[PDB]
RNA sequence: GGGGGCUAAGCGGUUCGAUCCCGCUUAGCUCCACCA
RNA sequence: GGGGGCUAAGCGGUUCGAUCCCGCUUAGCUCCACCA
């Protein structure tokens, strides 16, 4: 039972393009495929819309913090809604996956992403939420992951982070309408290339 | 500065003699040099001493808890006595050290140290107190830990960790009459073989 | 769930004096370990 | 600050059927990563 998704973002038009908004990627393809474009609520500190999923209630929300306070943003909602954690899904970009291939996951690490990481804090140092781990591949050299995060993916990438994202909408809403394990069955099935 | 000084250990005859005991070897024989023998006190579960060491007071504790339970006995201590994290030293048994050595820190992990562990999470998830690390060396296998830990250390190994032990004793009465800084030039420039 | 050992630069300490012994910071190399 | 990939056993799922695809659990192999 998922009450609230969430796809993590730095704001403004300089960032739209970045590897690190592949969340908010995510939830505005969603947003589009479930006709429920997204509108500004300051009080929640993002975009939100309000879907009906497996005939209940599920609130999207793309944050409009900087990436690092994205827990001001989701704990603001799961408050107000009384969400609990397991029933919360983060959309994110993930190094240890390549372009073209998306993964759930129930709690564990951040893997040094400053979004999760805030979001574990803000949240009461709990990580037992559910990820929507959406592959970005890994840079060359260690030392330039924050370029790599914050870089604009080549057109070839980009393609394939996009079907995998296209493929992981699809396995969402199959999670409301089947279940987690078919959704999951589907989705670690897929591998765009 | 430094108000308690912990010894860590499981409690009963057949562990008093085992390597998860270092850290109370430590304080027994640091009751010893400084005269105050340790008397049984139920509600620090654990035993206790009060010393002067550079001008002050200074309490000794050797919880009577199981290992893991040994931050019942801190946190009551540190709570009755308005001590603050920073200023306890925790002495225990540490794998990552070859017995012979011992070292301070301040602060950083447990190790899996199960002791250590329960300290960190009833000081409130604080790690932020000092420890002596008393070297005990690693098992040849690690799934063999626990066997190792609860092992009696062999005449020779022991012999090491006592030498170590009594010149970490010494070190630790420089650090309240000359400061941290020359105790550890001391004590991390001894190495008994 | 994070540690050992080592190198370089910088700073402070010990020391009669330290490129030599100790600490801290920045950057590396390496061995182990938790997630598993 | 913990992840990727793979192997074996056991359990469940997908599937017309799966030793072949997915999950979980126990044990292991390997690559990466945080402390650094």
Not at 139 to 151: H, M, R, S, T
């Amino acid at each position: 039972t998922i009450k609230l998704i969430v796809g993590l973002a730095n704001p403004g038009a300089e960032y739209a393009a970045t590897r690190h908004n592949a969340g908010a990627w995510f939830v505005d393809l969603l947003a589009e495929r479930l006709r429920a474009p997204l509108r500004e609520e300051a009080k929640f500190f993002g975009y939100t819309s309000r879907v009906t999923l497996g005939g209940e209630d599920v609130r999207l929300l793309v944050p409009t913090t900087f990436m690092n306070l994205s827990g001001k943003a989701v704990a603001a909602m799961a408050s107000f809604f009384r969400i609990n954690p397991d029933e919360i899904l983060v959309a994110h970009d993930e190094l240890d996956l390549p372009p073209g291939v998306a993964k759930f996951k129930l709690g564990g690490g951040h893997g040094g992403h400053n979004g999760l990481k805030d979001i574990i804090s803000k949240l009461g140092n709990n990580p037992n939420f559910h990820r929507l781990r959406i592959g970005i591949g890994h840079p060359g050299d260690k030392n330039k992951v924050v370029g790599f995060v914050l870089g604009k993916p080549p057109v070839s990438e980009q393609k394939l982070i996009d079907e995998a994202i296209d493929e992981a909408a699809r396995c969402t809403e199959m999670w409301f309408t089947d279940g987690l394990t078919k959704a999951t069955n589907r989705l670690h099935a897929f591998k765009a290339q």
